[PDB]
Amino acid sequence: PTFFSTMNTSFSDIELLEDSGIPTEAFLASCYAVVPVLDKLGPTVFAPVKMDLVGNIKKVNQKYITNKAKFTTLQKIVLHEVEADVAQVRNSATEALLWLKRGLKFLKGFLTEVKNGEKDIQTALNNAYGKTLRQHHGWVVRGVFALALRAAPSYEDFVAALTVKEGDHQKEAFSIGMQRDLSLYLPAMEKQLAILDTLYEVHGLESDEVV
Template sequence: MLVKSDVGGNIDRLARSAATNPGRYDADILVIVEDEVQAGGAASSSSSTKGLLWLKRAMQFVTALPNRLTEDEEESLSAAASETYYATLQQYHGWIVTGTFTVALKLVPARAMAHEGPEFLPRLTAAFVELGTRDVLETREFADACVTVLPIFNYLGSVFLIARNEFSSKNNTVTVKNSPGRNLHRLMNSILFISLIFQNLANGQAMKEAVAESYERSLAPMHTWVVRAGIKTGMMALPTREDFLRALGETESSALTHMQAFVKATERVVQEIARLYQGVTMPRSDFTFS
């Protein structure tokens, strides 16, 4: 998340300063500040003095958040993080940074996520392998297969609540007579999104890289620039590759087989649906952050 990135940058700044004179600076970090003050460089935006000040401010946020969570066990992590941010860091930020944090904090993960059992990914893959063998995509079978996809969005974190909400709502109307064609189009792109993530992970990509590339190739064209910006910011809170696979109940080796099978099976399903939209410009999603 943004605080983590900022903290990491300021730690690196202090480490570089300490490395310039280890004998003088290793014993007491405040000596760096004293030297910068005497040299007249403490007020510089790139000074270690500023870096240390921002580390102190970030630590106020980091220590206040757990306290708030323990005081109210029913409060969501997103709400607790937002309130803590406005009580600690927000006073030091301009409106642009505050706006970025406000969006990002709406997308932090839930307090805890139940892990799927080791049968989840095989069940998901089997549903689409079976679907891919059909000469005709039957509506009920397609809808049932789509239901098995939903938990994936939970383990990508709240940043993709957009995709999950759209996927769930559109899937509920697949069987309704005369339902809009855009619902099927949204479902197709959501399936493609998951398939591309699996393909990228199978190719050895890190989680953030795999998700970001998959998003650009599938869901991003349907979203307004505001939603795209919010999602890209929220990607800083994605789980690691290891945590994602663990949440799915898989190891690297066991996940590889199922992911490759899912990619192969969904390729035909996506192609069959995509043929229906050749030459058609679909409207963007009407999702907004509220």
């Protein structure tokens, strides 16, 4: 096994509910799962990333826990905010999920480069950044990304952070397992992100604001 098939981690183990509903807890658990990897790779240097993710998961969860029966899916949360005219209120779940999906599109891009055989982690990150998050960042935040990029792990340190037992990365079985697991993880994520993108587009929730 690899990190990408560990319990609660994979987007591929999330089954959709009626009307393509994305279950709230399972989705948020998949988002959280990368946090310990960030901590293995750079507890200080990637702290902005960790804080962003944790904060957005918190903001979605804060609405969820208010009425779990009502808020069984992401769509139910967003659509309630829209009905209540609170999607634009500070700390909304709609805003938190906007930034979660943006961050996941970046993660998907980066892991696709890796899956397709990119061994330069900086190249992989920077290629994915340009296509995803860069458009949403201003000058100062682009500078923070550039700082993070300089501190990118070696390929070996990166894959070592994705093993279930130390040393696994030196086995061919692991490379095969990475391919197996990413070949499920990535299209499952894509499917969910497409659902979310449609939801945001249709309801006029894709904000043009940059940070």
